[PDB]
Amino acid sequence: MKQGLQLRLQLAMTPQLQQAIRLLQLSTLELQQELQQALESNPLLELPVYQGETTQTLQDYLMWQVELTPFTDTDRAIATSIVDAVDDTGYLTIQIEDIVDSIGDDEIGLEEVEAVLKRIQRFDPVGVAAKDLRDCLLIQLSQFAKETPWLEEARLIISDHLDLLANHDFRTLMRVTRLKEEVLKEAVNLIQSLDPRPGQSIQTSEPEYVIPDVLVRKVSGRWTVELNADSIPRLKINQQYAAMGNSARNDADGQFIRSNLQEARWLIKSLESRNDTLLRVSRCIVEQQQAFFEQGEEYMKPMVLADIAQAVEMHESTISRVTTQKYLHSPRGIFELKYFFSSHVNTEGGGEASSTAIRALVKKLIAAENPAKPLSDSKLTSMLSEQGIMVARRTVAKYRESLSIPPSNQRKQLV
Amino acid sequence: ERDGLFCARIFGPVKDYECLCGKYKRLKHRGVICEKCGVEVTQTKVRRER
């Protein structure tokens, strides 16, 4: 009747489940780190060489040549110091002045440092120790014979006209360099194949790093999702200490051991239940994925924390902590749980959902517009009109930045 | 790892003379050890000599 609020409807909190959620929101790698750092005191809580082959790593390959090259002790020291602060791309990390300071010799000067670098500038490969790469591509072209045409045009452009090509400003470039029409592009292309980051070329090899935590294998539609068994932590109750407590003459001390053990059993069961709740949540998510992942991120409905926590009895904070730093390997592959949710929109697909791979493939088509110039946001809007889903140019710029696409008047290139 | 298997400050320095934290990454430091990490800026052979 006469509405309002009226009295109706305390105790003591503890951070127990709170610390547990701190673990769950924390990633399982460091979460297991704590799990070990936890189970340590809880006593009831459970060839050498193979192939053994060394490698060059490039800089030592440079040193191999330096050893065969004639060099003095100060020359060897300067070259070695130059080698010490070297980047993967093969450009010089520190300037010549920093190298002169590192040599710490008044006899060592910038000119001697430059001479040492130049004698070692193009030994292997061309354009090593690029030193703010620019003269590096210059030395690379200089290595090429002048018999190659348009070498002069490319050289004049690289001399002091890097900015004109930086914005892809072909008209301003032609107006400045007086470069030939439809021919200066030839010098540009000869410059384009100039082995940039040539030192980056040596580096090629890596091992694998992604942890499948849950596995949905699309088992006969509506994937049979399953976590990783070995990755799931588990303790073993000290049954010896369980039998070392009651019979303890201090039946008090031993039964208290039993009580602490029972409490830890509760803790472990709660963690397992956290895993299982995450698992049933994963069942709902996999029901979603049998269409979304199967239709890919393009046909994916944006979901919310509210939406998922509604399907469960889990609290919104409960889920919000539960999935933090979680990733599962699927038929698609290893995919992060934090990636699962997405913001919805005002598109005229009849509904609200997220751009995602739609935005990515939109960037793809905008690039796929005539390679002369990047497609503007109006192109995206028309593409969406064809898609029948509402998208806006501010929204287009947003989704493009999400796909990290180049700007419309920055990605224009000579076809 | 840290205070454990394959630890810097233990059995020797890091891949380069560069220390583990990141300080002293050059040929300039001969035995210098960073405050952020103490690992002598040195050769990697002694990984088999400590």
Add this chain to the structure above:
Amino acid sequence: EYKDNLLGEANSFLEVLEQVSHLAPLDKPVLIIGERGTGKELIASRLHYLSSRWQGPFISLNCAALNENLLDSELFGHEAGAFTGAQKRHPGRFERADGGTLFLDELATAPMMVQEKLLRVIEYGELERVGGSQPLQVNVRLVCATNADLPAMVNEGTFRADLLDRLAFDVVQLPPLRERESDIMLMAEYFAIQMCREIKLPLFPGFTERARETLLNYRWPGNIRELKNVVERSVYRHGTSDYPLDDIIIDPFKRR
């Protein structure tokens, strides 16, 4: 299209409809002088499916059953957690209005205060009952309809001059129940067929012309689906439309 249902062979039904059509692009208030058990709702529909914003919201919320004085304040709004015991205004009606019109049934009972609050709406329409929230307007049109005697209200002063005026922009007299007699035979058979079909009654009983005459005799002021209601009565009187139609039920209170 209201299925074109409720056919009124009274070319005045058509004429009303034509007025409706002229009103269809038109966006201003309208009264429908309806009848007891007549069916202003269905025609208002027939309009809404034809609305200038026919794509617009079409809600039916009348304050005739406004048992709560506060059901109003709601309909005018609520601050989020206004009073308390609640989260936010249940704003559905206020929702339909923006991107819509206003339709009500039997506007007689309104608290006069409620009414003139509606007045402060129609001319301007602030975010209302909103517990101090800043104003806000619903792109809201209107339509009115009742079986009451407007002069009776005027004598009652039931509609304020600002109210009676700005409230009203068109008047749609439902023909009297007996007014649309040829229409009566028409939509009567319309129901006859509609019933014989949907009932899946294997045969259609048809109609006794004597029953037809008796039915026409029914002043039947209520005919909204009161036509359909007496129709269901008569169908049960037949019970089954296999035989030719003669059993016509009007007054069902009678035992025996």
Add this chain to the structure above:
Amino acid sequence: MAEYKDNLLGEANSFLEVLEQVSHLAPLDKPVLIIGERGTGKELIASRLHYLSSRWQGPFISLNCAALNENLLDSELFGHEAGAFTGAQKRHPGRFERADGGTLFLDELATAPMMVQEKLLRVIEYGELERVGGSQPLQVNVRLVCATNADLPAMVNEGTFRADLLDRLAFDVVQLPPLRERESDIMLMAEYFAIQMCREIKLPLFPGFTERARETLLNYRWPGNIRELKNVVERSVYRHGTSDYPLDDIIIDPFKRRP
């Protein structure tokens, strides 16, 4: 300090002079109380004063009394800062509090709470207001704006208004030239509304109207002063719906049975 004349139309009676006096008042911020026909020059006058309120004056805090239900009308009245009244949370500032400096767009609704009346009396007390549980008084400011549509002195003799309802009210009065009285821009504002009406109708050409219509227009009472006629005008526009096609009649009293 601008025109914002808006659709303030049809003042060829001394309603022009009415506006003039309104202007004479406009600089002063003291209590405003007026009088006149509801839905008829009235809230337009309100707009008029809202323009008279400096554009930079502030929120034209509209006060619509036919609302407010019963009780916590009190809440937003005195205020509500405590718990158990308006969802608690922050001190909910009432529409009364919503106006700080704003328009006391008092509407003469003639609702029952002279309880309210006394409250507003304290609203118009010392420039101050105090909330529900409102632990302190707070000296408040707002422009004050009332009007009328009926016999306030009679209701005083009728006792119907709190005597002080009027006693605190109405530094002076401001009435309206009735439709039975104003009667001057008849054809004028008639055409103005007609222009708007055809334009919305996008009617290709101004129908024109016969003089029989204007003779009726003189004959008509137009009890609703401004709109009732205006509604009538738009109604003629509709019932015709023809361009350049000169009118000879108008649409007002659809309660008139059809022939």
Add this chain to the structure above:
Amino acid sequence: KDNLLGEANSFLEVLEQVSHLAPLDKPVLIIGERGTGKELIASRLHYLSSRWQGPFISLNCAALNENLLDSELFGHEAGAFTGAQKRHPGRFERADGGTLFLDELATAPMMVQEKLLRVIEYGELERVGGSQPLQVNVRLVCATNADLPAMVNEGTFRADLLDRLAFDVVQLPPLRERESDIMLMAEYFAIQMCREIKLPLFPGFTERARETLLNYRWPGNIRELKNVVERSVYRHGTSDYPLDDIIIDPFKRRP
């Protein structure tokens, strides 16, 4: 402490009367056909008393709302509904010895009286379920722009409510009675209005206006004098010519 005094033997008489009442803090209520600065009266009283250093800050009584008289008498409750938990104390206690004009008394309510009286007659701070009542001997006084003895005839109030005032209710003369410095009084009202109207100065009014001031019914006694004064001002807005006419009945509509 200072206001548009009525400058009058009746007015100065009520002045000496309240002056006899000055440091006195016993309960009180006001007599008066209307109010004639009813607030200003109790207000200057407030400015005077030992509650000058005390809280000379009133409270509007019959303002209040239905369910909450408890808190009203005693500020916000700790235990009322869950939300608040702090036994915020009497508005009285918010003064509790200051000067807090019990105004609006006439419009007050029935059981509302039933409590407030009894408590004032006897009751320390017994709040919602509290431990121990504390008597906030707060400077006590009410008012009546209306006739309580009439109300007694009606019997709406408590005869205890009759007891309420520990002081005799002074009254001010009717405007029809008082009508004393209204010449000078109006002159000051006009100096005021001209300042508010930013007007240069007042040449004056008609002596006919003076007689109409004499020939004035004057119900809104303390108000309407200055009221229609400045009303005549603005409807005139003219200072070059005397206010030969003054804004008589704004309720009257001119021809």
Add this chain to the structure above:
DNA sequence: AGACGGCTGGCACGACTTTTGCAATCGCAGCCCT
């Protein structure tokens, strides 16, 4: 050659999310002293 423009982003304001950060009482009965 100068206004055109389309873009882009800062700007801001709501719209939604969102984590963190709380802290026993009702009993018990065992103890301990007396």
Add this chain to the structure above:
DNA sequence: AGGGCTGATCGTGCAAAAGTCGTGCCAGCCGTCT
């Protein structure tokens, strides 16, 4: 045999503050262009 009696229990989700985004949209700009 009585008192004291005292610390012995045992929990957890959501709110409040914060952030934070959608969304677009004005200012400067670049293209070029007539």
